[PDB]
Amino acid sequence: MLGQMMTQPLLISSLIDHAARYHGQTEIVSVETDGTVTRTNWGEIAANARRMGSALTKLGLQPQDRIGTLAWNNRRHLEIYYAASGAGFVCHTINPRLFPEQLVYIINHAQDRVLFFDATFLPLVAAIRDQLTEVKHFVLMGPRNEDALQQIPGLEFYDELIETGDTDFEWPVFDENTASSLCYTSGHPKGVLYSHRSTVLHSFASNTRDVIGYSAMDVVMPVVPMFHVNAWGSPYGCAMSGAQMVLPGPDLHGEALVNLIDTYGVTLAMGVPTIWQGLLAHAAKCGTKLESLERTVIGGAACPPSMIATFREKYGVDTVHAWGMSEMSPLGTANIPLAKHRKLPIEEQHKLRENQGRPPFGVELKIVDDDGNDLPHDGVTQGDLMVRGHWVLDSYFQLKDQELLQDGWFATGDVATLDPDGYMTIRDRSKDIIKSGGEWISSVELENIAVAHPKLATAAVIGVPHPKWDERPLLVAVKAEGEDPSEAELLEFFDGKIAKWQVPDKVVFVDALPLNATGKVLKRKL
Amino acid sequence: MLGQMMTQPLLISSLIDHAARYHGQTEIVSVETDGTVTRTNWGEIAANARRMGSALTKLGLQPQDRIGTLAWNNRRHLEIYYAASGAGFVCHTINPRLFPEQLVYIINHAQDRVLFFDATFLPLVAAIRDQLTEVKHFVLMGPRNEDALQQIPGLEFYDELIETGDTDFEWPVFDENTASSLCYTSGHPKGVLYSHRSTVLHSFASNTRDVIGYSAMDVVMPVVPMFHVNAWGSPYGCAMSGAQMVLPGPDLHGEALVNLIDTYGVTLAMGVPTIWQGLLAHAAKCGTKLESLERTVIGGAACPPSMIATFREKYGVDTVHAWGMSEMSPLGTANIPLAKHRKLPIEEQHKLRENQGRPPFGVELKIVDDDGNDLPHDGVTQGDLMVRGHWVLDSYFQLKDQELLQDGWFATGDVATLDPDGYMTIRDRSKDIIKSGGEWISSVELENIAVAHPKLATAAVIGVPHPKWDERPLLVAVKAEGEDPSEAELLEFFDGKIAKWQVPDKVVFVDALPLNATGKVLKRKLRDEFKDA
Ligand SMILES: Nc1ncnc2c1ncn2[C@@H]1O[C@H](COP(=O)(O)OP(=O)(O)O)[C@@H](O)[C@H]1O
């Protein structure tokens, strides 16, 4: 027997409609590439998104065609998010800091039919343009620019394309499991293809109070890029709650960020540690209080504890350490305390804020041993982190037969501990660990010693099996030009640079490593 | 082309599993019927829920059979919530304050096969038992009690039935649009048949900051009964967040509630206005500061503005005024500020927290006129309030094809304004609005002015017939403790706050307002009692 409630698909276009309906005047600030600052609002972004969704449809694109972006956090990128997905296309956010050969691969593999880009990346797009066979419209995210048209003959312009859209466009209605957007990971990059369902449930979860939780009273500054992992979902979550937004565009250095916070009264800022280090450096120099800032979200790389202490003690700002990855849309955990934590001594309360955090409803975590078996969640045993839930991927884009999931779970590639309350601690990368009995050994830490040897051009380190220690490191070295180092002096080089028991057991000389389409397939091991 | 994400049904059983995995030691306090206090936790509620779900599966029940409850807010009720819905049955909470004859109607119309009930209602179930012929299991929520076995032959006992369930029961996996739970709302009462998907989506919305947002650090005390729209969703939202809970049991008078707040450190409490009058009344007498209380959710009836002021001014407690209905499972609107409001003068800011609030993502509101056409959302025009969304009902139980919706909207029966910011103001239920002269009078606006008088503890305004004006407002007032206002000064208190012709013509004094089964003023019996003068 089914329930008797209204049923409605969980569509991304319903988020922007809600912001337009009940928060249409709520202010959104957009730092443009030409130095301009746009003052717009959710209502205007919704109208532009609808009109651009019509304009995209009138190009004759097919349902779920990919729409690529190479763009900063700005109002036109926010509009494309809703325009592409809302109209039933796939919003494909591309990282413009990648190497050109990586962009060529991603754009062609995704088969973006449209490529929106910001003016910053005009030389970059012009350079790879002739390798981008499948792209039918190149669109600068601004108005007609004659120098731009010189670099890319045939270029189109956002501010002209949008005027071709019908002003009374109606979002189509489709199955909520329809593909919505696309983000590639760091061999080649692999694309994770989100649905409207997974996006919307992820925003729901992120909008809860113990995860991030956007309020309409917030001024939210996503410094995390919209070009990677959806800016942690904040373009979706801030629409759900009608939060104010400050989109910082290309100027992400410390002085510009501190000025955005103080000029617009940012209450919630989201970034990664390197960007925050620039912000904290400037703030300490100019003596600002960051008066309006209440809390920050830091994810993407391990949040340093002394950064948490700085925000807390200099500024009275709480730091949410959050963890995730492209494959989880991105949010996996967030470090918020539990009730029982108020009764610990204040200093123990501070160290509890340091790990990657606890998972919200909708995501489940476990750690497994090297044969796939569950390990206790005692906070001390280390295992391969496995995840599943409503916004974890099932398979990579154009790669379904590769049996990604293991017993319905996704292997993150991280080694972690998990305590009984699900607080997770990244410890290592599964692919980097050689499981020498007793203490494990990092392969890259051994490589970085080895490649620094002046008589070695390069070298690789692999775990190779051993009858007593299970897995032991082997050094695969290629001698520097005109040099002939002995095995003994290469291993002697490790003396004092690392514990003796981690030194590779044997040296093997190759004249070259066997390359994949760029890196080294050390699965040989043969 | 579909996405390539894991897809899993939105099941109520994943809420309790999540709480057991990651909040398994988070504490839940349960005031029991006998007079005892159980200290348990989500891990324990979940293990008992899993095992009760096994035991109910072994009774032979068929998928989505109704499991009825007549119960207070306590650990066993919470366990049944998850045991029943998790096992694929329909958790049917029944209000034990209805007349026994209404209960017979409801239980037969819903065809409950199992009837869990607290010891408080042993007499009442024994009296109406012979008219509940489709109930196969009467389960006292407690251990074997031979006196109980006396009043009800064949009576089974919760603490015996649960031990029949496997300790390793795996929840079944079924369509998220499967019926999960049923609540009757008031001709005859009608059933609202919720689904697992609607339930989980409503829990997601209630857990946002600007609605309620239960935190793992909250101590949550729902005084709202788990038989009134599932205690406003809180057994689901709290499980989703792993909040601590205080389940108050049978004693909901002010002194009992004050003691629970101070004894267990309640941070967030939720209830209809009348339960907050007793609490605030007693708190003023004993002098408590309600130290742990941070927040309150007050809805079901209009929160008096002076009640909001008291919590804010006297306790530093912020009151979230919220509106909803059984048909919206229940959340419709919640009153939280917008950023713009922080610039306004401080008392325009207090003023904006008085209305019923603004809708969250998942809910849509509009008002329509008597012909059904849209009305401006200008904050002043009045119309019939209409709703649609992910947790709004499509049709009533056993009444699937009866043209309930108007162009896909559900008609709430409330008269309201809606402002351009989406804030909703209840003018009145359609049934209580007063038609005096040629214009409508909001009884709700009138009573809340009267309640604010410092010499009244509470008050109600009702329309009574008048030979010239059709009907006229009557002030039914309750004198505050230590106060003795005259009729005239209560009437003069209205001057300037409302049009002259809207001031009630007369005051009558009563010791208490008659309350219905959800603690709302029974204005119908007030209109009967005072049909003269
Ligand atoms: N904050 C509120 N202010 C005024 N009325 C309210 C409020 N919240 C709920 N209600 C009223 O209660 C109604 C919903 O429930 P009701 O009709 O009393 O039966 P039930 O609560 O069992 O659904 C609403 O339609 C509205 O009339």
| DSSP string computed for B351-384 | HHTSS-BBPPTTEEEEEE-TTS-B---SSS--EE
Task: Among A63, A195, A336, select the one facing B216 at the smallest CB separation.
Answer: A336
Determine the distance separating the centroid of ligand 1 and the alpha carbon of B324, expressed in angstroms: 6
Q: Which amino acid is at A329?
A: S
User: Over A416-479, what HEC string results?
Assistant: EEECCCCCEEEEEEHHHEECECCCCEEHHHHHHHHHCCCCEEEEEEEEEEECCCEEEEEEEEEE
Kindly report the nearest CA distance between residue A479 and chain B, in angstroms.
45
Determine the distance separating the centroid of ligand 1 and the alpha carbon of B427, expressed in angstroms: 12
Q: Measured between alpha carbons, how far is B401 from B378 in angstroms, rounded to an integer?
A: 35
Number of CB atoms found within 10 A of residue A509's CB: 15
Closest CA to B434 of B464, B458, B411, B414: B464
> Do A399 and A184 contact (CB within 8 A), yes or no?
no
Strands (E), A470-516: 470-479, 506-509
Fold topology of B428-533:
GMP Synthetase; Chain A, domain 3 (3.30.300)
Burial (CB count <10 Å: 0-12, 13-18, 19+), residue B380: exposed
Residue to substitute in B97, B323, B445 for testing ligand 1 pocket (most ligand atoms within 8 angstroms of CB): B323
- CATH topology of B1-427 equal to that of B428-533? no
The residue assigned the tokens 């070009």 is: A227
At B330, give phi and psi (nearest 5°). Answer: -110, -10
Angle between helix B42-58 and B75-86 (nearest 10): 50
Kindly give the pairing relationship between strand A244-247 and strand A219-222: parallel
From the options 3.40.50.12780, 3.40.50.300, 3.60.15.10, 3.40.50.1820, give the CATH code of B1-427: 3.40.50.12780
Structure tokens at B234: 């809180």
Question: CATH homologous superfamily for A432-526?
Answer: ANL, C-terminal domain (3.30.300.30)
Closest CA to B225 of B275, B261, B159: B275
Nearest CA to ligand 1 atom 6: B301
> Do A498 and A449 contact (CB within 8 A), yes or no?
yes
Closest atom, ligand 1, to C-alpha of B429? 27
If DSSP codes are grouped into helix, strand and coil, which group holds residue A339?
A: helix
Residue to substitute in B426, B428, B431 for testing ligand 1 pocket (most ligand atoms within 8 angstroms of CB): B426
Chain A residue numbers touching B195 (CB-CB < 8 A)? 2-5
For ligand 1, whether the C-beta of B429 sits within 6 Å is yes
Q: Within 13 A of B356's CA, how many CA atoms are on the CB side?
A: 28
Burial (CB count <10 Å: 0-12, 13-18, 19+), residue B188: exposed
Sheet of B363-368, strands arranged across: B363-368, B383-389, B410-418, B424-429
Which residues lie below 8 Å from residue A369, measured CB to CB, with a gap of 6+?
Answer: A375, A383, A384
> Do B489 and B501 contact (CB within 8 A), yes or no?
no
Q: Measured between alpha carbons, how far is A495 from A116 in angstroms, rounded to an integer?
A: 53
Q: Which amino acid is at B145?
A: N
Determine the Cα angle at A418 with ends A414 and A421, to 5°: 145
Determine the Cα angle at A317 with ends A361 and B290, to 5°: 70
Q: Measured between alpha carbons, how far is A279 from A262 in angstroms, rounded to an integer?
A: 12
> Do A121 and A97 contact (CB within 8 A), yes or no?
no
> Do B357 and B323 contact (CB within 8 A), yes or no?
yes
Task: Among A1, A3, A205, select the one facing B198 at the smallest CB separation.
Answer: A3
Would you call B336 and A209 a contact, using CB atoms and an 8 Å cutoff? Answer: no
Structure tokens at B201: 């989506």
Structure tokens at A89: 């296309």
Please state which architecture CATH assigns to domain A1-431: 3-Layer(aba) Sandwich (3.40)
Q: End-to-end distance of chain A based on CA atoms, in angstroms?
A: 58
Structure tokens at A88: 């039933």
If DSSP codes are grouped into helix, strand and coil, which group holds residue A297?
A: strand
Closest atom, ligand 1, to C-alpha of B323? 8
If DSSP codes are grouped into helix, strand and coil, which group holds residue A343?
A: helix
Residue to substitute in B194, B229, B230, B325 for testing ligand 1 pocket (most ligand atoms within 8 angstroms of CB): B325
The residue assigned the tokens 């006396």 is: B150
Structure tokens at A2: 């089914």
Closest atom, ligand 1, to C-alpha of B413? 25
User: Taking the domains of chain A in order of start, what are their residue ranges?
Assistant: 1-431, 432-526
Would you call B5 and A393 a contact, using CB atoms and an 8 Å cutoff? Answer: yes
Determine the distance separating the centroid of ligand 1 and the alpha carbon of B201, expressed in angstroms: 21
Alpha-carbon torsion (A100, A102, A103, A107), positive or negative: positive
Q: Measured between alpha carbons, how far is A114 from A66 in angstroms, rounded to an integer?
A: 7
Closest CA to A227 of A101, A89, A72, A33: A72
Determine the Cα angle at A57 with ends A54 and A60, to 5°: 150
> Do A513 and A476 contact (CB within 8 A), yes or no?
yes
Nearest CA to ligand 1 atom 22: B185
> Do A222 and A272 contact (CB within 8 A), yes or no?
no
Catalytic residues of B, which ones? 185, 327, 435, 440
Q: Which amino acid is at A458?
A: T
Determine the Cα angle at A426 with ends A425 and A427, to 5°: 110
> Do A307 and A334 contact (CB within 8 A), yes or no?
no
Would you call B5 and A392 a contact, using CB atoms and an 8 Å cutoff? Answer: yes
Q: Measured between alpha carbons, how far is B337 from B339 in angstroms, rounded to an integer?
A: 7
